[PDB]
């Protein structure tokens, strides 16, 4: 059950300085990358084109190449329209894509954020603001909804292109997505005992401090932190009194270990 995200971020510093960069994720694997610096979108995987032919990719990337230039100009003009109400610096973020379910079921989204606040989404047939959004955005939204061409294209992209494309990606990237890399663990202290776990994919993992059979309820699991090689890092910390570290261990369960859990006795 996977989610495809096209995360775009745009930063307008002056009237005449901006940049827009994009990255694309399928679950937690990056599949595309588009620097302001490059005229073209880059694949970060072998299978990033999906089941699309070369001709369909060209047509699709050209749409984006024109989007980026047009997007930049529009924003710059929309600033001029609202001036002096909102001025630079301006940060703009899109989050666009489609979550995929079994059968044919999908849900496509396109959320826009302004200065870090989610303000606009594309819904059904048009752009609309969301609860909390300023009232001044009604003029921008009225102007963006005036552009019937953009609306039709965006409708096609959300309703058809995204789910078709992602169904393609999932077949082509099957082996990288179903990947099974094993965690490696190690111990340390500072007393707070730390069980480091690293190298594991996919993201679901279980880490507990075990005094033999009994689970130590004080085990504080941290955040999942990324490694560079598209695997994960996690550490669980237990808080103890000194001299009490005998008969204590860290048990780690993961899909790749195949029943054979990692046990580190301290």
């Amino acid at each position, epitope marked *: 059950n996977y989610t495809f995200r096209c995360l775009q971020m745009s930063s307008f510093a002056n009237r005449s300085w901006s940049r827009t960069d994009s990255v694309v994720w399928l679950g937690d694997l990056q599949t595309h990358r588009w620097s302001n610096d490059s005229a073209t979108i880059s694949f970060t995987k072998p299978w990033s084109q999906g089941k699309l032919s070369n001709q369909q990719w060209e047509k699709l990337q050209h749409m984006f190449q*024109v989007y980026r*230039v*047009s997007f930049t*100009r*529009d924003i710059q*003009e*929309l600033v*001029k*329209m609202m*001036s002096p109400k909102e001025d630079y610096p301006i940060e703009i973020q899109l989050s666009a894509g489609c979550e995929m379910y079994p059968g044919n079921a999908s849900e496509s989204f396109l959320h826009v954020a302004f200065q870090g606040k989610y303000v606009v989404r594309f819904w059904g047939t048009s752009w609309q603001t969301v609860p909390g959004a300023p009232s001044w955005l009604d003029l921008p939204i*009225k*102007v*963006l909804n*005036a*552009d*019937q*061409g*953009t609306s039709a294209t965006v409708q096609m992209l959300l309703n058809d292109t995204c789910p078709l494309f992602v169904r393609g990606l999932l077949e082509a990237g099957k082996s990288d997505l179903e990947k099974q890399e094993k965690p490696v663990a190690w111990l340390s202290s500072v007393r707070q005992l730390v069980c480091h776990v690293s190298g594991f994919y996919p993201k679901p993992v279980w880490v507990m401090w075990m005094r033999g059979d009994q689970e130590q309820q004080g085990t504080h699991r941290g955040d999942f932190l990324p490694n560079a090689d598209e695997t994960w890092y996690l550490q669980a910390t237990l808080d103890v009194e000194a001299g009490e570290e005998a008969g204590l261990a860290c048990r780690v369960k993961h899909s790749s270990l195949g029943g054979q859990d990692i046990i580190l006795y301290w």
Partner: T-cell receptor
Amino acid sequence: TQVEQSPQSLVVRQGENCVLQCNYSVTPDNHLRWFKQDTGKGLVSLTVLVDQKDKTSNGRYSATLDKDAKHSTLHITATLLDDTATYICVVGDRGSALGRLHFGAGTQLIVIP
Amino acid sequence: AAVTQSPRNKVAVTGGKVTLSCNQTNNHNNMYWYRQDTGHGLRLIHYSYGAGSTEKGDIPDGYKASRPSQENFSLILELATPSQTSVYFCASGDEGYTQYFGPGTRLLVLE
């Protein structure tokens, strides 16, 4: 100069047809409009083409647009003396007021009565 | 959706102040000023997105704009030159693409 028209000028006898060319490099190309301008006066819109492959009519004026080609033509059937005028091609790059209009320098028609 | 211009015609001297006015009762937020010159298409000088706004277009040099109200958008030449001899055109429009053009203003700047 992203909007080029052809011929620059042309002379025809009353009753004859003519074809006016507009080729453009503008990106994107939301819509193309054909204006009529009598000498001295101002801009009467004749038609506006919007689709990828579009075809419009307005009496004796008809026109085409192919956006892959970035090419439009205006066909005038059975020229009348009043058609003596400059015919101007305009490409708008948005379907909203955020757009910019890119104007051709026009094709001058003279109809001999 | 009508747009008027005044004056319709003007003879001015080099260095004089000329003001070309454009009025519009459509309640259009947006107004635009072009100039027409033989061998070129219409070219944008200034535009406005509402009262109090004035933006530079493609060839703004020599021209100041002013949008005192929703109704009026003026083009001001402080120190007219002979090169500003042209036929000026004002237009307006709402959020859509269509710009509704005025009848035009001839200007001749003599030495």
